[PDB]
């Protein structure tokens, strides 16, 4: 679990969005596993606007942060799950690191701010949904 709170927006994994997220929907994209909902309170986070390929993510299944080198946002095949059919997930960045399904929502940050959230994984792999291209989050 986990979310980004920026301005009057809440960014979550689309497959973990609540009834309240859907009732206050701003934007969602199944191909990215993202959903953004509106909030009444002002957020605590800021978004990176950069091309960093290194950063640190929070791994809830280890209660620890880990440093990672990750690929640029790309279209990557993701196997079927209870949440989605087998498809290409877009704007996804992969890295070597530990992850389990419940780790989705953990934030990846670089020196500039929030880069994205955990969305996929594998055997010693962790994949992050990028949010740096969503310029409207800042206004």
Ligand X SMILES: CSc1ccc(Br)cc1CC(=O)N1C[C@H](C(N)=O)CC[C@H]1C
Contact residues: Zn ion, CB under 5 A = 48, 50, 52, 110, 112
Min CB(86)–ligand X separation in Å: 9
Contact 43, 5 (CB under 8 A): yes
Min CB(40)–Zn ion separation in Å: 30
Min CB(53)–Zn ion separation in Å: 9
| Count, residues near ligand X per rule CB under 6 A | 18
27 sits in which H/E element: strand 25-29
Check binding of 84 to ligand X (CB under 6 A): yes
Output the six-digit token pair for 134: 């969503």
Query: What three-state secondary structure class fits 83?
Result: coil
Q: What are the catalytic residues?
A: 15, 33, 104
Q: Which is nearer to ligand X, 38 or 81 (CB)?
A: 81
What residues have CB less than 8 Å from 8, skipping those under 6 apart?
A: 38, 39, 40, 42, 43
Is 59 within any annotated ligand binding site? no
Q: Which of 5, 7, 46, 83 binds ligand X (CB under 6 A)?
A: 83
């Amino acid at each position: 679990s986990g979310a980004i709170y920026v301005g009057n927006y809440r960014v979550v994994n689309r497959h973990l969005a609540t009834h309240n997220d859907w009732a206050n929907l701003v934007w969602e994209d199944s191909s990215r596993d993202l959903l953004v909902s509106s909030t009444t309170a002002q957020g605590c986070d800021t978004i990176a606007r950069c091309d960093c390929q290194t950063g640190v993510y929070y791994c809830s299944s280890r209660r620890k942060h880990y440093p990672v080198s990750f690929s640029k946002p790309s279209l990557i095949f993701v196997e079927a799950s209870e949440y989605y059919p087998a498809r290409y997930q877009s704007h996804l960045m992969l890295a070597v690191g530990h992850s389990e399904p419940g780790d989705c929502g953990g934030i990846l940050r670089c020196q500039h701010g929030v880069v994205g959230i955990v969305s996929t994984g594998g055997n010693g792999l962790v994949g992050f949904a990028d949010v740096r291209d969503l310029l409207w989050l800042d206004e």
